[PDB]
């Protein structure tokens, strides 16, 4: 049943790519969280 | 074993939908937290 | 074999719950920082 | 039947690693916003607002 494996594979690669870009926006969120906590 | 693989692909698809909604929520969060710095 | 599909099926199921907990948690933090804008 | 089953399983394992790595960072962000709101709430009548959603 390799065909449905390929169908799920084309999306499961996109899952890891999405995880990497959400890590990117989490660090870009973390910078302005930290700057905020530094100075009040 | 095709039905388990199909419902597996459905689970991967709704996880992708969840990550898309999470990414939209984080972009909305960044638009929210930009008000911190004009506030202070 | 079915069981080796079942292990990775559970492994892909639990993260969809984890995403929803993170999203609702970060919306609660959105309400907190909204009150922080209201204070300052 | 090697490549399908165990390389996709390895991909889900890498995904789980990355999610716990994200969870730690979100937890530190939660710490900073909660202590800043708590320091703001000292001396006023500000309400307590929740952080964790609900029990299962």
């Amino acid at each position: 049943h390799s065909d449905s494996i390929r169908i799920l594979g084309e999306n499961i690669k996109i899952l890891d790519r999405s995880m990497k870009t959400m890590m990117e926006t989490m660090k870009l969120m973390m910078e302005k969280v930290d700057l905020l906590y530094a100075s009040t | 074993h095709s039905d388990s693989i199909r419902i597996l692909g459905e689970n991967i698809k709704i996880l992708d939908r969840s990550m898309k909604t999470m990414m939209e929520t984080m972009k909305l969060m960044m638009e929210k937290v930009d008000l911190l710095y004009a506030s202070t | 074999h079915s069981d080796s599909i079942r292990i990775l099926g559970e492994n892909i199921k639990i993260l969809d719950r984890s995403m929803k907990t993170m999203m609702e948690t970060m919306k609660l933090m959105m309400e907190k920082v909204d009150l922080l804008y209201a204070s300052t | 039947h090697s490549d399908s089953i165990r390389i996709l399983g390895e991909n889900i394992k890498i995904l789980d690693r990355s999610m716990k790595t994200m969870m730690e960072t979100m937890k530190l962000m939660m710490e900073k916003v909660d202590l800043l709101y708590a320091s703001t709430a000292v001396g006023t009548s500000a309400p307590m607002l929740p952080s964790h959603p609900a029990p299962p």
Partner: protein, 1129 residues
Amino acid sequence: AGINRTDQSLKNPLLGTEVSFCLKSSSLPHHVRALGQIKARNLASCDYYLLFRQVVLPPEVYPIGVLIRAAEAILTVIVSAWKLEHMTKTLYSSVRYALTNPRVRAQLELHIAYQRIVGQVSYSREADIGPKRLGNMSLQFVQSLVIATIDTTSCLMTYNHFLAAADTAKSRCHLLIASVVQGALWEQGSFLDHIINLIDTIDSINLPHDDYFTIIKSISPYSQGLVMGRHNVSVSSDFASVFTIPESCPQLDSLLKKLLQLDPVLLLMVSSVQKSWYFPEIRMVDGSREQLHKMRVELETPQALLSYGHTLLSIFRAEFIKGYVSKNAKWPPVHLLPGCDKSIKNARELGRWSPAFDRRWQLFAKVVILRIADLDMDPDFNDIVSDKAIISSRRDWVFEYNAAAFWKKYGERLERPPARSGPSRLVNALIDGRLDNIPALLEPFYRGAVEFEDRLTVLVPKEKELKVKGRFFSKQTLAIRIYQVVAEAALKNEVMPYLKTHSMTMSSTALTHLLNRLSHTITKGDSFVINLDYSSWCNGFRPELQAPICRQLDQMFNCGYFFRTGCTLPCFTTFIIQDRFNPPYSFRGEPVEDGVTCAVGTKTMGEGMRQKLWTILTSCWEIIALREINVTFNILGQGDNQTIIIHKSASQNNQLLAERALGALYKHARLAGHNLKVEECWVSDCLYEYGKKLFFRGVPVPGCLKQLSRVTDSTGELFPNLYSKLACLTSSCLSAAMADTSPWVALATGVCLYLIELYVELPPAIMQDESLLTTLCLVGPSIGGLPTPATLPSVFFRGMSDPLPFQLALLQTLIKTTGVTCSLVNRVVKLRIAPYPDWLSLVTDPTSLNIAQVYRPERQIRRWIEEAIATSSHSSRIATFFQQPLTEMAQLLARDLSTMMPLRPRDMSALFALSNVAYGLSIIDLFQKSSTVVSASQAVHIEDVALESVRYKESIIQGLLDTTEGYNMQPYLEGCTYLAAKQLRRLTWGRDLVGVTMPFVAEQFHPHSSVGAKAELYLDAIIYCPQETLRSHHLTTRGDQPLQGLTGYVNILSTWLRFSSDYLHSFSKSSDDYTIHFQHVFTYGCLYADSVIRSGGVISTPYLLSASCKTCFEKIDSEEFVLACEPQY
């Protein structure tokens, strides 16, 4: 009217806001009356001790010679009963010299004077009791207010001031008796003269109130400073230089230095007393403002606390993984973040802890520990309903303040609802069923928003403390106590046994090994002890420090945001302080902040909250600071007091290690907002403290004076009566004898104290009869009498024993030695055998007798306060235990288990314990024996507890003066007592019992002289060989021979003696064959050696314990027991 001036001892703090409200023209009717009686010179309430210290009595006003002759008789009977008869010439002479010296005697008579006036004025429906003369003082008792007068001087007081004066006199009576009895039993002479000099010196300090309690607070640290300064050999210390005793009271200074010159041990015992003097009046405004300021101070920056909290989280992670590898031989479920070291990966895959990880804890910042266990959200409620006072909800704040004072202070009424409007305690909330769903109530803590009705905390000052500004403890509401119980139970169960520095403290063998190595180590130039004290420990912790470790605990126990709600809880909690006649203002039903009386939002909660987290946090920076300077260290920790053991490095002298260690600890204490002070920490190699026992040169300091001088709570959990007072005295003597106080001193103290506690209440008809007073002190609670310190075998022996052979031994010795017939024994015992066997009493206590005890008071809370259950509430789980009779089910299972034909009460008491029945009886026992239920249920239904007191007093007096005899006990008081206890148990129970009868040792074994022993006595004996000649100083220094284990008072003498079992000609050592308990016999032989040495004799030859009673050696078989009838359980 209602009950007034209820307390019979000091339990509340001494405050003076009511006196200030009274002296400024209050419109209350009793305040006008109390203002009328004050004289021209009205002293302030703070100088009440200046007015109470001038009391003098006429000499010998109470005839107590009958007590002296009686006490000599009782102690002669006990010393003759143990067959250790070198002791009595030291003992009765000690009691006679104690009660014949006039300065001791006057304090006895003063004790009886205050005790009699407390007996009269308390629990009275009379509002104003007239003039009561105490020596040269007149007292007028206008409700709570007390008006004292001597000549023209006066002091408006509250009733707690009079109770504090009474307790001070009581404490000095105990100290003067215990000093004579203790000093009779040393090689060192009597020290009563120094105690009288100390009394006159402290009573001669004419100084203001704050300065006086500054001198009183600082006596024990200064004496410890002099001892440390003179007796340090390697490290040098300057602790004595802080205190101001040489420049304020030189008369105390000369006395303390002359006691230092004579005896170092004596100075610590005399200087340890801190509750035998008067007590401070707490300055509420200044101390309150300082307390609320200490909850909002920021010694360090917010960011530095967060960084150093991450640093503490790293060493927490290191110790938890170290403990998990040490115990379970694998690594916990962990996550390795990117950037982790190769050593951590290689050691996780191999499952091994290298030595090099402990010095590098910065690497353990990427190892995130995952779910170890789950949270047991339903806890044991043994500790839930005990020892704490708990508010119902937010709207109970209006019940701690007077309405009239609020009306005059702010100009509007309080508008308080007249009903109580909440549970008075936790079990009252258990009736209403709030606590049936503990997770549903801990769920607002779980989500992160606790309810508005739970965010209030009342700060109550602490009683009987020597600080003029006072110490305060938290009174919380219902939910936060359950939160604290779950949190502390969770940390104690899963977190703390893995951490090694805590695990050595929570293990008996490791702690015993550490304290045994310390005593041998410190005297030979190795090791030194560093002590740290944190004055602002509970108020110093901040939300930034706790949140990393709290978040990691949340991840480990899989509890979402549970340890992190307690850090942010002080920033939303309303804090008001409890002192009525100074109320906070109310706007809309809520308290309003003014900085002194109310505070909306602190940064810390209070004392005792979140304790187990702060103990781990306290350990973390000390481990960091001492590992960074490369010293071998062991930390023994008890809250704010930390004692640190630092051993020797071969290169450097120990002074250099002391300087670097103090520098490192002072450096790492500052980063957590907890600044240690150089004036409150000492480094010593001769003196240290652990577990409330002070150690000098590795030997414990005797603590007879502090333990006997302590005034217990008295008349525990009941209306006032004689039985509970003597039970409290008996428990105090046993608890003092537990912690290395000599049994003879505690016994001879407790006999005299028991006699005076009788003389306060009993009429003069009883107390002028010598034989009646001798018999009535020798009956005990075993055969139906009063609680007695003399009748316990648990004083001389550590383990539990069977009391009946000892009791029959004393009562048999009384007839043969003292001129008392058996008629008086049958008069005082009054043995009433019940025809119905009560097997439930046998399984609640395996040695009890089916007798009638008429002196035990009615419990009245047991299942008899049940009237509130049927009316107030409908559905609860505690009502399942209350409304149905578990006594009837218990009696049913008792008749089921009575059918065992070889009956064993120990096995029966086991099978009830393993069943649900005696477990449920234990739960019902937990509700009756609990704090905050007794006082609150005592404050409701006001008249019944006073009427029961009058009824019980009349009943016990009419019973004691009655001369009707009971069962004839002449055959049970002759011959051996072992068979006598067996036949008496057969008489009460109806069937024979085998296994619960422990023969008494002096009955069993007769000490005999080594030169004069008979050959048949020599044939069956245990030989105790000394290695050298033993004199008085051998009781101090530990010998070469190994310690077996014994009791702790003869442990030093056990190291000079060799004992072996050489009675094998008659009985071949009896491993599980006969009724010989070896610890009791070896302890009794060592007590023989102690009685020979302390009475002026020496031991030079091996002494022997010879068998005396043949019948006392009766078999225990491999006896099968068959339970005949079918169980109906």
